[PDB]
């Protein structure tokens, strides 16, 4: 779809603005826009000089002292830019069954939901995240609702590792609402025919989907980038039981698996 950084940059050019003095802020449009949306930060109209730090989506981000010309500086208290924030995608986490679980289980689930905020703010913004079915929960500007209300422009899918619809670049790309649990299609992410090795963690699933949608990355590469040592180990082990040792070496270069992983997988066999 569109990242917050991209929408921000298109509005900025329209007005006529292609340089910002950022002073002491992380020099990324995403970060700057998030900050503007969440704090009293904004743009102040002032003429300043600097050197380039970067050229994000075509906008010269300035600081320090040099010879690059800013007409606008990003400052605590400046004026907001007004940007049609992307309605989509909407990432929904369902906490319906939440009080089936153990105390220790609830603390793990919620820690995982907490980390979603950081993922959502890496591409979109808090508004694109919704949590359903727990009303005392508060996660920055996430929507916190008791039940999910569907609109005509919503085209949703349920992420379910026991689903009957295998996920695909196109299927993730052609949908815009995604429900991840604590009557639409129930969609299962596999690695290469299998669910084994696929990260289990709510915040990792969410990040896999966004990588595919916002960065134009493949599902395979997305999954692999987000695996833990344990995901790789468990998958190599499985596949060596299946296909034998000839598989090990090459399937480790593909899983991008490091020495420690391969060491361990050897050590389990002999
Ligand atoms: N490989 C995968 N494919 C699709 N969805 C997944 C997935 N791994 C995790 N999820 C999502 O992450 C949530 C937490 S995993 C626990 C749910 C598990 N299906 C169960 O029945 O116990 C799941 O409900 C699912 O929404």
From Swiss-Prot:
- Domain of life of the organism encoding this protein: Archaea
Q: Any idea which UniProt keywords this protein has? A: Cytoplasm, Methyltransferase, S-adenosyl-L-methionine, Transferase, tRNA processing
Query: Which InterPro entries does this UniProt record tie to the protein?
Result: MT_TRM10-typ, MT_TRM10-typ_sf, TRM10_methyltransferase, tRNA_m1G_mtfrase_arc
Enzyme Commission numbers on file: 2.1.1.218
User: Which Gene Ontology BP annotations are present?
Assistant: tRNA methylation; tRNA processing
List the GO molecular function terms.
Answer: tRNA (adenine(9)-N1)-methyltransferase activity
- Substrates-to-products reaction catalysed: adenosine(9) in tRNA + S-adenosyl-L-methionine = N(1)-methyladenosine(9) in tRNA + S-adenosyl-L-homocysteine + H(+)
Per the database record, which ranges form the SAM-dependent MTase TRM10-type domain?
73-233
Q: Where in the cell is it found?
A: Cytoplasm
Give the first-level EC class, as a single word: transferase
GO CC list = cytoplasm
Q: Which cysteines are joined by disulfide bonds?
A: none
Q: Which residues form a coiled coil?
A: none
Listed PROSITE patterns: SAM_MT_TRM10
Q: What is its main location?
A: cytoplasm
Database matches in NCBIfam families: Trm10_mtase_Thprot
What is this protein's function per UniProt? Answer: Catalyzes the S-adenosyl-L-methionine-dependent formation of N(1)-methyladenine at position 9 (m1A9) in tRNA.
Q: Which family does it belong to?
A: Belongs to the class IV-like SAM-binding methyltransferase superfamily. TRM10 family.
Q: What is this protein called?
A: tRNA (adenine(9)-N1)-methyltransferase
The source organism is: Sulfolobus acidocaldarius (strain ATCC 33909 / DSM 639 / JCM 8929 / NBRC 15157 / NCIMB 11770)
